[PDB]
Design a protein around this ligand. Structure first.
Ligand SMILES: CC(C)(COP(=O)(O)OP(=O)(O)OC[C@H]1O[C@@H](n2cnc3c(N)ncnc32)[C@H](O)[C@@H]1OP(=O)(O)O)[C@@H](O)C(=O)NCCC(=O)NCCS
Lengths: 5, 158, 914
């Protein structure tokens, strides 16, 4: 999972 | 069961998957960027009667002839009524096969250091640990959580 | 260095980007005004546009000015002014690649598909490396998906594109990957499937090895659309010999094996068996393959659930043709019992046995459950207690037995004493299931949370079939206990949202929808649970925030998906561009967008309208023209989820397609009641300075208020986890439909008096006199139906009344309309009274009596004095005092906002006394 922005 | 590609109009059915505390929803420019640029690394899995079992996003963005052409994993989730089936290992195996086909040079990953489930799964698949990014996962008042950059070297090729 | 220093300081955050750019005007060329203006488009549009349109007409031909103006025009939802930039940079200079490519991207932004083709072909004529030739061919299908169902869609646009591609297939300028996808898309769209299959199976398909199975999934679609079954069966069989788990190929294998014994297929004497080889026929050739897949799966360390479900699918499809001839597949009860014996401890045993549960003989559903209970390792029953599991492996095998007892229709036969003993048993098992999973990491479901949900779906099943009201509080304490133990289960939060809304509370609903983190594109599929109940229960601040969040998502959808249709030419998608077009149409034609948009305009009206905004200056800031609706009405999507709730219900009482269809019909009827009310309200400024348009919206509104009233009489019973019946049935019981219609008739009579005059109109003035006196007597009758008590204490229970709160929001939303229309008639009679005799003395009495009614309703919303005086396992006896303390303190917060709005609405009647 990566960060949203 | 039914390892197909994540069409748009599956952004409206993936709600047993994204109502987890560890799974994000990323907005629509993110999903459509990863559908336009890299639609190979965007497998979804579907049960007999719909019920999306769980998707996997991903990209391959680096630079060859610096030994950095790597294949990322930028989401992975399995719906909580379909876990412990071997589905997540199947989706990581398919992403390693795809990112081995187009050259290769490791597979990366970003996992927060809170869940020993995901980290102790990636230790068992074969992923070693690289640097620990400090204060990576930002929010959404909640504290920022560090991230284990994980790298699995596979089948070295330009 | 005047261009690098002055610009990098002009992009700092907001105001250092703005002040250093505003100081860069008297300091020094073609774009200094644009860099000074682009950071003050926060709230003021005209102060930005007075230099935006000034700098968009000076022939800019610079990358900074054009790159900033293509952001400034795109952010204001006006892309039509982007295309007029780069052609202004083309007609001055015929640039090689940059301005022509940006002009093509601006055309694809604005949507001009018939004008993008000429720009793409011109850019191919200038610099022909070879993606610019296929951008014009993609636009030649962009102008064929828009204008569909025509001879001029497959005789003028698609064969031209096929000839445009086939001019390059004769040559060798096809050496890429997206062009084979584009040529297959064109050859598929035209209807030449036989010619489309051979471009994959031939030489151009070998360049198609980019995805996993993008060759054998594009041959299967053609093998189906050509009705070529034996080359479909062999491909599905050869893809099942690789995974033996794909359910998408067991289905095509069975579909194209039983059609091969329907067609009476016989193999050729030469060849292998077909173009893919080793084609099976029916039964024997299809039973031995499945009974081989089971055996080959049995010798692995993975335990696939593929072939065990394939056996049951084969035994349903052999039964669907001829049931008397059975070979060796066995009874489906023994197969489902052995599938439970293997895959019992997994959470997916129900959701695979759900689809094959029709195979049971419909009478042995109480013998199959007693057979399944014999294999779970449970303890000894009669130690003055219940029979309990001992592992986690033997708790999931019992949770699946309780779920299958629910699905087979055995918790719907009992009669509310056994159906409370079941809840007692499933709460003892939930309280025991917390000994395991004590060390869970707080982001997992405790291991037996679905013992709580099966003891809540059996309490709401008693409440909806007896009207008990002593079980809703029990279900709420069960969900609150289950949510304080595993505070990341989302089914508990969704059911708590639903039960707290169906009781009348909404403060815990906004605090529980903020908890499950619903981010972008959940606002279309879970946000209906807030939008439907937000303004309905009198919570206006939470309704304003919910409408603002959903509107922010849908407007960002419009802009951002236009940008990412542009950015799928550059990466050579050409197969997702119809998918991205269908995604934009699904999210702009969506039902929840129309509901959030019209409820946002109606909230802006009845909060900032005739209080502190002039209904005329309040309409101009929303562009509500009462001759145009931006609602599609014909491609209304309704992409709400409706299956986000786990329901173990017996598959003949949950969410059929009939309930989804009737729910869409009811939301469209109430949206046509809401949008017509909004458009009829917005004609009242713009009525004093045509009535020919506001007399037709009344004929539409009294038609849809009769269609709704005939819909409510069609007494439909939605299930509890179903689609949430609308306020329309509560709009007619509390008589407020006729109470607004009898006012939109009054504005019609006042306009006819205005265009006629008070000279010889003694027939209109008596009708206005009898309309005031009958408009107030309906407002005194909404009050008699909304007069009651919101919380009781009757025989030790609570007995919440939410109907007396919904009829009290339908009164504020009605007297807001009455005080808008009555503020119009004050704008008509006051110049007549100043020009100087029987009818204004009945307007003065109507005005002196509607204040005397608003004081009475602002004193019955002193239920705050009547609600604050309620004094109202032992841990279950603690959570009752939090559940009831949440329902009471949400009724109090609803009445606070409604009383605070009426105490501002009563002050507007001091500007109407004339
Ligand atoms: C839930 C999740 C475990 C997926 O399950 P999965 O893909 O079916 O896992 P698998 O069945 O394929 O097996 C992988 C290994 O993970 C381990 N594992 C999975 N769940 C575990 C648990 N609760 N406890 C201990 N180990 C666990 C197991 O050791 C398993 O090995 P096994 O095959 O011998 O059982 C996890 O991957 C997930 O998707 N979480 C939601 C998103 C997330 O948390 N992280 C995304 C990564 S950034």
């Amino acid at each position: 999972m990566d960060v949203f922005m | 069961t039914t390892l197909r590609a994540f069409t748009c109009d599956d952004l409206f059915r993936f709600n047993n998957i994204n109502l987890d505390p560890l799974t994000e929803t990323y907005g629509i420019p993110f999903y459509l960027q990863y559908l336009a640029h890299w639609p190979e690394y965007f497998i979804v899995a579907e049960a007999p009667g719909g019920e999306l079992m769980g998707y996997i996003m991903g990209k391959a963005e680096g630079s060859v002839a610096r030994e950095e052409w790597h294949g990322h994993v930028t989401a992975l989730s399995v719906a909580p009524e379909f876990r412990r089936l071997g589905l997540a290992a199947k989706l990581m195996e398919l992403l390693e096969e795809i990112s081995e086909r187009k050259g290769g040079f490791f597979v990366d990953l970003f996992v927060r250091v809170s869940n020993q489930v995901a980290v102790n799964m990636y230790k068992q698949l074969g992923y070693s640990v690289y640097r620990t990014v400090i204060e990576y996962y930002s929010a959404s008042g909640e504290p920022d959580e560090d991230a284990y950059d994980m790298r699995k070297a596979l089948s070295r090729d330009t | 260095x005047x261009x690098x220093x002055x610009x990098x300081x002009x992009x700092x955050x907001x105001x250092x980007x703005x002040x250093x750019x505003x100081x860069x005007x008297x300091x020094x060329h073609c774009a200094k005004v644009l860099k000074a203006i682009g950071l003050q488009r926060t709230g003021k549009q005209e102060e930005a546009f007075t230099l935006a349109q000034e700098v968009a007409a000076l022939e800019p031909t610079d990358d900074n000015s054009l790159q900033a103006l293509t952001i400034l025009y795109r952010e204001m939802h006006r892309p039509e002014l982007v295309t007029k930039l780069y052609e202004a940079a083309v007609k001055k200079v015929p640039n090689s690649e940059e301005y022509h490519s940006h002009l093509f991207m601006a055309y694809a932004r604005v949507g001009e598909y018939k004008k993008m083709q000429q720009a793409g072909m011109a850019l191919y004529k200038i610099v022909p490396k070879n993606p610019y030739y296929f951008w014009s061919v993609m636009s030649l299908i962009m102008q064929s998906i828009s204008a569909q169902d025509e001879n001029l869609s497959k005789t003028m646009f698609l064969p031209l594109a096929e000839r445009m591609v086939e001019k390059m297939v004769k040559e060798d300028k096809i050496e890429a990957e997206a062009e084979v996808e584009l040529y297959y898309m064109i050859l598929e769209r035209l209807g030449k499937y036989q010619e489309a299959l051979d471009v994959i199976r031939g030489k151009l398909g070998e360049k198609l090895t980019s995805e996993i199975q993008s060759r054998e999934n594009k041959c299967m679609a053609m093998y189906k659309k050509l009705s070529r079954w034996p080359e479909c069966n062999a491909l599905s069989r050869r893809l099942l010999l690789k995974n033996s788990d794909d359910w998408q190929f067991y289905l095509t294998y069975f579909d194209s094996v039983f059609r091969l014994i329907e067609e009476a297929w016989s193999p050729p004497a030469e060849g292998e068996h077909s173009l893919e080889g080793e084609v099976h026929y029916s039964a024997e050739k299809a039973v031995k393959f499945i009974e081989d897949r089971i055996t080959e799966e049995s010798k692995s360390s993975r335990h696939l659930r593929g072939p065990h479900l394939a056996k049951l699918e084969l035994i349903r499809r052999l039964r669907s043709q001829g049931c008397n001839d059975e070979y060796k597949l066995g009874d489906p009860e023994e197969l489902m019992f052995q599938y439970f014996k293997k895959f019992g401890d997994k959470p997916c045993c129900f959701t695979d046995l759900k689809v094959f549960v029709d195979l049971l003989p419909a009478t042995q559903c109480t013998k199959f459950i007693n057979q399944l209970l014999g294999v779970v390792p449970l303890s000894t029953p009669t130690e003055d207690k219940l029979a309990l599991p001992a592992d986690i492996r033997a708790l999931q095998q019992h949770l699946c037995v309780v779920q299958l007892t629910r699905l087979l229709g055995l918790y719907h036969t009992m009669d509310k004493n056994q159906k409370l003993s079941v809840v007692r048993e499933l709460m003892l098992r939930y309280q025991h299931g917390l000994e395991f999973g004590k060390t869970c990491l707080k982001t997992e479901l405790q291991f037996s949370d679905y013992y709580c949900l099966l003891a809540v779906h059996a309490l709401i099943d008693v409440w909806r079939e007896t009207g008990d009201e002593t079980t809703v509080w029990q279900a709420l304490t069960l969900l609150e206990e289950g949510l304080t133990h595993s505070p990341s289960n989302a089914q508990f939060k969704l059911l708590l949202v639903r039960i707290y809304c169906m009781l009348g509370a909404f403060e815990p609903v906004v605090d529980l929808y903020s908890s499950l983190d619903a981010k972008h594109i959940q606002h279309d599929t879970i946000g209906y649970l807030l939008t439907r109940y937000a303004e309905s229960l009198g919570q206006y601040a939470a309704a304003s925030q919910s409408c603002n969040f959903a509107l922010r998502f849908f407007h960002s959808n419009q802009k951002d998906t236009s940008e990412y249709i542009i950015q799928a030419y550059k990466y050579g998608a050409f197969e997702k561009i119809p998918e991205f077009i269908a995604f934009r149409n699904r999210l702009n034609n969506s039902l929840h967008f129309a509901q959030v948009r019209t409820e946002r305009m109606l909230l802006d009206l009845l909060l900032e309208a005739n209080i502190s905004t002039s209904l005329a200056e309040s309409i101009k800031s929303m562009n509500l023209r009462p001759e145009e609706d931006d609602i599609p009405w014909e491609d209304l999507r309704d992409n709400r989820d409706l299956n986000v709730f786990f329901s173990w219900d017996p598959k003949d009482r949950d969410v059929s397609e009939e309930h989804k269809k009737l729910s869409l019909e009811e939301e469209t009827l109430w949206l046509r009641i809401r949008s017509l009310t909004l458009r009829l309200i917005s004609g009242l400024p713009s009525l004093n300075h045509r009535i020919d348009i506001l007399r037709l919206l009344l004929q539409q509104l009294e038609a849809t208020l009769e269609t709704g009233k005939r819909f409510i009489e069609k007494d439909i019973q939605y299930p509890f986890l179903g689609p949430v019946p609308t306020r329309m049935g509560g709009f007619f019981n509390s008589g407020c439909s006729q109470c607004q219609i009898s006012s939109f008739y009054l504005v019609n009579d006042i306009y006819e008096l205005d265009t006629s005059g008070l000279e010889d109109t003694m027939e209109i003035q008596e009708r206005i006199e009898n309309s005031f006196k009958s408009l107030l007597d309906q407002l005194k009758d909404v009050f008699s139906k909304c007069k009651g008590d919101l919380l009781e204490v009757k025989d030790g229970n609570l007995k919440t009344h939410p109907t007396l709160l919904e009829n009290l929001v339908f009164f504020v939303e009605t007297i807001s309309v009455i005080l808008w229309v009555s503020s119009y008639c004050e704008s008509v009679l006051r110049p007549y009274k100043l020009n100087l005799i029987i009818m204004p003395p009945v307007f003065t009495s109507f005005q002196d009596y509607v204040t005397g009614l608003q004081t009475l309703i602002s004193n019955v919303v002193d239920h705050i004095k009547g609600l604050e005086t309620h004094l109202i396992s032992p841990e279950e006896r603690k959570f009752s005092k939090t559940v009831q303390g949440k329902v009471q303190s949400s009724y109090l917060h609803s009445l606070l906002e409604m009383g605070e709005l009426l105490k501002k609405r009563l002050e507007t009647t001091k500007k109407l006394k004339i």
